[PDB]
Amino acid sequence: SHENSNSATEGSTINYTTINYYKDSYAATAGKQSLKQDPDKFANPVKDIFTEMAAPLK
Amino acid sequence: SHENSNSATEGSTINYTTINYYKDSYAATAGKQSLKQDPDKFANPVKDIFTEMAAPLK
Amino acid sequence: SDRVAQLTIGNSTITTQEAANIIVGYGEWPSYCSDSDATAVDKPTRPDVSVNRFYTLDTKLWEKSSKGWYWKFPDVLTETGVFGQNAQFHYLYRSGFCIHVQCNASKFHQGALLVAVLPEYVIGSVAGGTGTEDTHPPYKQTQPGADGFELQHPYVLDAGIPISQLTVCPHQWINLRTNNCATIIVPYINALPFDSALNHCNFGLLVVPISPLDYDQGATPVIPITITLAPMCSEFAGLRQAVTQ
Amino acid sequence: GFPTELKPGTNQFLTTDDGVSAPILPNFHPTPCIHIPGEVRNLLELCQVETILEVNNVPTNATSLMERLRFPVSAQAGKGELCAVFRADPGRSGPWQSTLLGQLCGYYTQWSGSLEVTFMFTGSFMATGKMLIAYTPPGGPLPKDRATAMLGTHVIWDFGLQSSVTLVIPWISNTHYRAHARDGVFDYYTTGLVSIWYQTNYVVPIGAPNTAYIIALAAAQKNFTMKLCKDASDILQTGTIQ
Amino acid sequence: GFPTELKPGTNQFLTTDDGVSAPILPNFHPTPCIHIPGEVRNLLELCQVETILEVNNVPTNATSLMERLRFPVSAQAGKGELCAVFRADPGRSGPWQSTLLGQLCGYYTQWSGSLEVTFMFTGSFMATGKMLIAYTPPGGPLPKDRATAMLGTHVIWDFGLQSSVTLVIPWISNTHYRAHARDGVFDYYTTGLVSIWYQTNYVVPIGAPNTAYIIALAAAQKNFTMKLCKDASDILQTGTIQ
Amino acid sequence: GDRVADVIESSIGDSVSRALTRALPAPTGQDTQVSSHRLDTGKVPALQAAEIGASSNASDESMIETRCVLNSHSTAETTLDSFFSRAGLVGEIDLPLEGTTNPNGYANWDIDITGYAQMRRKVELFTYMRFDAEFTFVACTPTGQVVPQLLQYMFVPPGAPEPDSRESLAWQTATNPSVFVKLSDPPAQVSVPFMSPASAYQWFYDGYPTFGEHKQEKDLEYGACPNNMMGTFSVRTVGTSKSKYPLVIRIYMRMKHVRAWIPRPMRNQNYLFKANPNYAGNFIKPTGASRTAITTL
Amino acid sequence: LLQYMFVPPGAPEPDSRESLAWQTATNPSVFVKLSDPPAQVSVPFMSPA
Amino acid sequence: EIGASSNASDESMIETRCVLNSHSTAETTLDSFFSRAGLVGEIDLPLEG
């Protein structure tokens, strides 16, 4: 398997290999991906952060 | 072989791998399975269990 | 020696000391019911032991020409008592059971009864009897009440059900050799987790005399059979006001 | 793909073949497995269930279709006269395949082993009886009297306190399959018989009715095996669902 | 390639199948990924956004299409009379699917869970009020008075300094799917209701106008899930682009 | 704090469905051998009676003895659960050029196992089921020959409107993928997974799948659910080249991924509608033919 | 347009072009046609003895 | 939004309940798999036109 790829799309957490019926390489299964979500800024735009013990509002 | 599966059916006693001609993975041979049977409760619903030496009935 | 029961409520009660033993089920562990898969996410409750106790619902007679009877579960107590109102105003129900049927015969009497509990049974109704002419059965056979209803044909169970092939369910015999009373054990089983108490019908009992009643003339013609039930550790979900809709 | 030449195995109308199948909707999650009773790995596991068997349902009328339990009890002569006989084979059409075990056996060709049988009783306290439960392996004509029962190995039975009578018939089968033929006058292949006898009489005290009729019971053990399913032979449908 | 025989899976008009595709231009480098907002991994992530909901847009005139915000406020009787009611289901056609959450739910068949709601207020300093926010799970007819609100568990609401009123409706759903039927007189399947009530009156001091009408708000939490998309049902196009 | 102990009676240890009984696992098991007649106590498990498993206070076999049998049979691959499929006629349909039963040129059929009760009743012996299915459509001439025509297959997912014309919108079916098949290609072979709304298909079910009070009007939904079903299938000819031969199709059925429960016994009568408990009461006949005597044929 | 139907042992012998034996429920189906290569079917050893 | 209790009590009169989860959200994404059946379009190349 002396062959490399010419793709620059990143964002993989596990190494994996691919094999294609065509001469190219990335046309096979893209692999398994997880799910990520972070809606904090969408509903909570607060700059003044208090300590965990203290109440947020006066 | 950098590829996982998206199936949640359990009940296997030996690890095994699968390869499919389609893009999916579980369409290949399901593997060899044993046979299990337990008809005890069907014909023997007894709660009062005596020791092995003693007779079951008075 | 765990065939005991402590029962006292109202003004009368029935307990046994040397009865015909018990039937065990599935050889299993106690547990509550699944909670983290409902449509909503609100916390459940536990009604505990507030009202669960035995009142007899009917004392069914057995006669010379008995043709068969049954009941609708849990339609027997869905309409009467504080349990009745609770089931009416509450949408989800689940509990275990301990069925104890009282069935005695004297020295004179001979015979046996065919009492079969049939779960999940889609009821074989009259459906016009013949059913070839589209005259739908009235509501007087869907909600009979505390009286139950009379089954038409024994050896087909009104649905084509040959008798010798009823052996799948827990099978019991009523004989003075066998039992002074019979015990039946059934847990809560449904193909779906949650349903209403008015739309879906779970199952019902079935009684058809396996042997004809016989006696030399001069004895009692009919034989009463008593039935009561009290669900153990009942829990109701879908807690809401007294609102049917 | 890499090119090769043609080989047989395609362009044919296939039904028995098990081929890989392509799903339509990727990544679907149905309801998870839920613990419910009634699951069956194999029918042989089901074969060890108590099975009600009614042998002599001789009447053929609708009004008799209410009391098929009956077997003859009356003021018997009580001199070893025959009550009822029935051959050992459970795989023949009739009230024998009426049982679920028999119903499953009716779809099968081969069989390995025999069944286990018993019979109940419903007399009163003082009421009793003295019957005779006897089996004869294949190889003889109809039995005549107690002497034929003597020729047959079985277990002596008596109505005491216990009603059940466990009669086990072992794997009496030399051949697992036979030469292929068709139906005809080939009834020479005997399969055995079971005979029921009275000894003294149907005995009850004065003040007790002289009738007590019960149904039989049977089941299968691990030894018996049953497979090689055949297609349906009898089913009633005047119309088909459109 | 090595020769084999034919198998099913070709020469068929396919649409659902995902097959390997051959590109035309090897080694192409488009513009690189650039960090821009608006990317969505899943609609459920979008479901946790504040969503304006307008319930009682009863008028059906173009000139009313400027003031659909209105809900009835006037010189009320102030004796527990009803303001407005609306059933819990968000997946039915109308002003309910008007919301983006509802618009997405309108394409779906199943649903797991309920929503979260609130309502705002725009009175002056001394101006206040005393309303009643109440939910009833399915299983009852139309509410009558405060007693029906008593039957329904909810949270008591009051116009104090804070205007918002967070009403969360948990996963009140016993079944994940139902028996398949068609539209008709099958309206027996109730889904719940929400009722709005007055207690004393719309109270303002002299010198203050007696009108204050606001719009509602709603959103979805992690518990609710929504999928099984259906095709488009209503779209207007008199001509197609040529 | 911890003062009252009213609630402590609970039995934490949740394992399975609600009950009150209790048991316990064991590490190993027990075995038994065979012997001959002897009067002794302590260890004598040689013979086994399924219910009693001992000897009564009145001897059963005091007069004669027994024998022994040896085993040479294997039961590893005797299971039928999935492999029980064998030969049997299944069914067919037709799409003629000129006809009266098809005035529209297309045929839309509701997909279900209720096709032909003759062989479905064999599978209908159960109520709660999870399985995979397969549909095969083989095309040929009504005479029995083969003709090179132009045909294709469109699938109808559940929830889509039922086509009422040859030009309905249902042909676009945006969310439905496309299968690349032609008469030259092998006939149709489509897998069908388990998309039941509930855990299993509802046939022996007494209920009301529609909301609202139950009346005589809403009674037809028994068996024929307009929306709960998994959809239909529509067949027609697409393109400017219209076929000049009538065609016929044969539909082949096969089941995989068996998983069953709820044993339900055999039926000896006939229905008149889908899952109709009604029966020919005036002509009830037993499951088997009897004889005037049991002794002799 | 031709096709091949198999008759397992024990099935009734067809006496008409429309017999029930065509359904042969327990018999699988082979996907063959005159364009496909001719029939090639393996037969194992199912002797009763 | 608030995540606390106001200086005027919200639920001083009655209590609440709890709900349990049994649903999975691993493969519920639509981003690419949201394609289903639907009519799309056609064109024609006649001989004479």
Nearest of C171, E241, C61, B19 to residue D217 by alpha carbon? C171
What φ, ψ does residue A53 adopt, rounded to 5°? Answer: -75, -40
- Helix (H) or strand (E) holding C82, with range, is helix C81-89
Burial F244-255 (b: 16+ CB within 10 A, else e): eebbbbbbbbbb
Q: What share of chain E is helix, strand, coil (3-state, %, to 5)?
A: 10, 20, 75
Q: Is the alpha carbon torsion for F251, F257, F258, F260 positive or negative?
A: negative
Flag whether residue F80 sits within 8 Å of chain G, measured between CB atoms: no
How far off is chain H from E124, nearest CA to CA, in Å?
19
CA distance D45 to B39: 7
Flag whether residue B3 sits within 8 Å of chain C, measured between CB atoms: no
CA distance C153 to F280: 12
Flag whether residue E38 sits within 8 Å of chain A, measured between CB atoms: no
Collect all residues with Cβ–Cβ distance below 8 Å to A49 and sequence separation of at least 6.
none
Chain B residues touching residue A1 (CB < 8 angstroms): none
Nearest of C242, F214, C198 to residue E144 by alpha carbon? C242
Contact yes or no for F197 and E176 at CB 8 A: yes
Closest Cα in chain C to B44? C24
CA distance E102 to E220: 10
CA distance F290 to B48: 45
How far off is chain F from H38, nearest CA to CA, in Å?
2
Nearest of G11, G1, G10, G8 to residue G33 by alpha carbon? G1
Collect all residues with Cβ–Cβ distance below 8 Å to E49 and sequence separation of at least 6.
A42, A43, E100, E219
What one-letter code names the amino acid at D104?
Answer: L
Residue E1, exposed/middle/buried by CB under 10 A (0-12, 13-18, 19+)?
A: exposed
CA distance C232 to F19: 8
How far off is chain F from E183, nearest CA to CA, in Å?
8
* Chain D, window 41-100: residues with a beta carbon less than 8 angstroms from a chain C beta carbon: 49-54, 65-69, 98-100
Nearest of B43, B30, E70 to residue D46 by alpha carbon? B43
State both tokens at E154: 């909810």
Q: Which residues pair with D128 in a beta bridge?
A: D203
What φ, ψ does residue C236 adopt, rounded to 5°? Answer: -120, 130
Q: What share of chain F is helix, strand, coil (3-state, %, to 5)?
A: 5, 20, 75
Please say whether the beta carbons of E113 and E219 come within 8 A. no
Q: Any long-range contacts for C73-82 (C-beta under 8 Å, 24+ apart)?
A: C73/C202, C73/C203, C73/C204, C73/C205, C74/C197, C74/C202, C75/C143, C75/C201, C75/C204, C76/C146, C76/C229, C77/C229, C78/C197, C78/C198, C79/C145, C79/C146, C80/C146, C81/C51, C81/C55, C82/C51
Give the mutation candidate from B38, B41, B57, B58 for the C interface (greatest C CB count, under 10 A).
B41
Chain H residues touching residue C239 (CB < 8 angstroms): 17
Q: How was this structure determined?
A: cryo-EM
Chain A residues touching residue E22 (CB < 8 angstroms): 22, 27
Chain A residues touching residue H33 (CB < 8 angstroms): none
CATH architecture entry for C5-239: Sandwich (2.60)
Please say whether the beta carbons of E114 and E170 come within 8 A. yes
- Owner of token pair 């006037």: E74
How far off is chain B from F254, nearest CA to CA, in Å?
16
- Helix (H) or strand (E) holding C117, with range, is strand C114-118
Q: How many residues does chain C have?
A: 245
**Number of Cβ atoms within 10 Å of the Cβ of C223:** 21
Closest Cα in chain A to E40? A37
**Number of Cβ atoms within 10 Å of the Cβ of E210:** 13
Q: What share of chain G is helix, strand, coil (3-state, %, to 5)?
A: 5, 15, 80
State both tokens at C219: 């004895």
CA distance C46 to F6: 14
- Owner of token pair 């039915």: E92
HEC string of chain D equals CCCCCCCCCCCEEEECCCCCCCCCCCCCCCCCCCCCCCCCCCHHHHCCCCEEECCCCCCCCCHHHHCCCCCCCCCCCCCCCEEEEECCCCCCCCCCCCCHHHHHHCCECCCECCEEEEECCCCCCCCEECEEEEEECCCCCCCCCHHHHHHCCCCCCCECCCCCCCEECCCCCCCCCCCCCCCCCCCCCCCCEEEEEECCCCECCCCCCCCCCCCEEEEECCCCECCCECCCCCCCCCCCCC
CA distance D52 to D118: 10
Give chains near G: 3+ CB pairs under 8 A. Answer: D, E, F
Inter-chain Cβ pairs, chain B and chain C, closer than 8 A = 16
Q: Which residues pair with F255 in a beta bridge?
A: F133
Contact yes or no for C31 and F14 at CB 8 A: yes
SS3 label, residue C55: strand
Chain F residues touching residue C201 (CB < 8 angstroms): 206-207
**Number of Cβ atoms within 10 Å of the Cβ of E51:** 20
Bin E133: left if φ > 0, else alpha if -120 < ψ < 50, else beta: beta
Contact yes or no for G37 and E8 at CB 8 A: no
Beta strands F190-192; F132-140: pairing state: antiparallel
Contact yes or no for H39 and F175 at CB 8 A: no
CA distance E10 to F148: 17
E and C touch with 3+ CB pairs <8 Å, answer yes
CA distance D14 to E62: 65
**Number of Cβ atoms within 10 Å of the Cβ of D140:** 13
Nearest of F108, F215, F82, F195 to residue F160 by alpha carbon? F108
Chain F residues touching residue E8 (CB < 8 angstroms): 186-187, 189
CA distance E173 to F9: 31
**What is the CA angle E212-E129-E72, rounded to 5?**
40
Contact yes or no for F87 and D84 at CB 8 A: no
Nearest of E113, E112, E90, E116 to residue E103 by alpha carbon? E90
Collect all residues with Cβ–Cβ distance below 8 Å to F290 and sequence separation of at least 6.
D57, D58, D59, D60, D94, D95
DSSP label at G36? S
Contact yes or no for E32 and A8 at CB 8 A: yes
Fold of A1-58: Rhinovirus 14, subunit 4 (4.10.80)
Q: Radius of gyration (Cα) for chain E, nearest Å?
A: 25
Q: Radius of gyration (Cα) for chain D, nearest Å?
A: 25
- Is it true that the peptide bond before D95 is cis, omega within 30 degrees of 0? no
Alpha helices by DSSP H, listed for chain F, are 117-123
The ranges assigned to domains in chain C are: 5-239
Inter-chain Cβ pairs, chain D and chain F, closer than 8 A = 163
Collect all residues with Cβ–Cβ distance below 8 Å to E175 and sequence separation of at least 6.
C39, C192, C193, C194, C195, F198
DSSP label at E62? T
Contact yes or no for E5 and D1 at CB 8 A: no
DSSP label at F181? E
Flag whether residue H38 sits within 8 Å of chain E, measured between CB atoms: yes
CA distance G25 to G12: 13
DSSP label at C76? T
**Number of Cβ atoms within 10 Å of the Cβ of F166:** 12
Cα-Cα-Cα-Cα torsion F15, F20, F25, F31, nearest 10 degrees, comes to -140
Distance from CA of residue E85 to its chain's centroid? 15
CA distance E128 to E122: 9
Give chains near C: 3+ CB pairs under 8 A. Answer: B, D, E, F, H
DSSP label at E105? H
How far off is chain D from C168, nearest CA to CA, in Å?
8
What one-letter code names the amino acid at C14?
Answer: I
Give the mutation candidate from F211, F216, F229 for the E interface (greatest E CB count, under 10 A).
F211
H and G touch with 3+ CB pairs <8 Å, answer no
Contact yes or no for D16 and G29 at CB 8 A: yes
- Owner of token pair 């065609």: F247
CA distances from residue F67 to C188, C194, D115, D153, D172 in whole angstroms, order as listed: 47, 56, 16, 10, 11
Please say whether the beta carbons of D63 and F295 come within 8 A. no
Nearest of D68, D77, D198, D215 to residue D128 by alpha carbon? D198
Residue F293, exposed/middle/buried by CB under 10 A (0-12, 13-18, 19+)?
A: exposed
Which among D99, D121, D209 has CB closest to C165?
A: D99
Give the mutation candidate from B35, B37, B40, B58 for the F interface (greatest F CB count, under 10 A).
B35
- Owner of token pair 């005597």: F293
Give chains near F: 3+ CB pairs under 8 A. Answer: B, C, D, E, G, H
Q: Which residues pair with E229 in a beta bridge?
A: E108
Residue F283, exposed/middle/buried by CB under 10 A (0-12, 13-18, 19+)?
A: exposed
Q: Which residues pair with F232 in a beta bridge?
A: F110
Beta strands D167-168; F132-140: pairing state: unpaired
Q: Is the alpha carbon torsion for C168, C169, C174, C180 positive or negative?
A: positive
CA distance C198 to C91: 9
Nearest of E43, E165, E61 to residue E111 by alpha carbon? E43
